[PDB]
Amino acid sequence: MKASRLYTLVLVLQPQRVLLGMKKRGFGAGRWNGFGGKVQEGETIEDGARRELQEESGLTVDALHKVGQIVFEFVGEPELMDVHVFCTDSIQGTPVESDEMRPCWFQLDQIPFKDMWPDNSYWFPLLLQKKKFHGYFKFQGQDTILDYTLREVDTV
Ligand SMILES: Nc1[nH]c(=O)nc2c1ncn2[C@H]1C[C@H](O)[C@@H](COP(=O)(O)OP(=O)(O)OP(=O)(O)O)O1
Ligand code: NA
Numbered sequence: 001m002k003a004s005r006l007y008t009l010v011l012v013l014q015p016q017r018v019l020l021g022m023k024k025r026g027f028g029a030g031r032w033n034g035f036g037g038k039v040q041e042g043e044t045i046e047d048g049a050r051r052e053l054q055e056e057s058g059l060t061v062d063a064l065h066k067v068g069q070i071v072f073e074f075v076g077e078p079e080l081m082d083v084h085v086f087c088t089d090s091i092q093g094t095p096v097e098s099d100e101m102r103p104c105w106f107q108l109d110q111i112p113f114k115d116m117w118p119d120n121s122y123w124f125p126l127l128l129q130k131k132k133f134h135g136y137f138k139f140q141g142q143d144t145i146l147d148y149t150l151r152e153v154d155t156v
């Protein structure tokens with residue numbers, strides 16, 4: 001039995017495009033990802049997701065809808081990442097680059113899967129179909145999946 005830490009992940013998904021953020025600095029830079037980070041004490045998971053979206057992309061939203069939950073395990077790390085996945089389509093400002101993140105729109109026939117986390121190829125298609133899901137992925141390093149499960153669910 002392992003302990004888990006709570007994280008959020010936010011996909012700004014509009015009818016023809018998705019907003020992703022490229023990690024600019026540190027280890028892992030170069031990869032495109034949704035926006036998010038660790039949930040803080042006292043805030044709801046949804047409010048943590050809204051906060052990270054604002055801090056990381058500049059976008060504010062009044063509300064997000066929860067679309068999935070994914071547990072990530074990394075070889076050599078005993079703590080699991082419990083990632084709660086949310087989707088916007090409703091935004092009211094422009095994305096802003098920082099020293100840490102560069103946000104960019106991609107058309108939905110140009111989703112940059114090869115430069116995203118490898119798990120995204122599996123669960124993103126469900127998100128695009130407006131389906132909900134639970135997933136688990138075990139990684140060796142940043143690129144190699146050793147085991148995974150993915151299921152569509154009616155309720156997250
Ligand atoms: N395999 C994966 N697939 C994916 O789509 N997103 C992943 C992922 N692994 C991690 N992430 C996302 C989840 C979360 O949004 C982010 C990881 O959170 P961070 O470590 O950036 O959190 P914080 O910015 O709160 O951390 P601090 O450095 O403590 O401030 O990256
Ligand atoms: Na944070």
Ligand code: NA
Pocket residue numbers: 035036037038056
């Ligand atoms: Na983050």
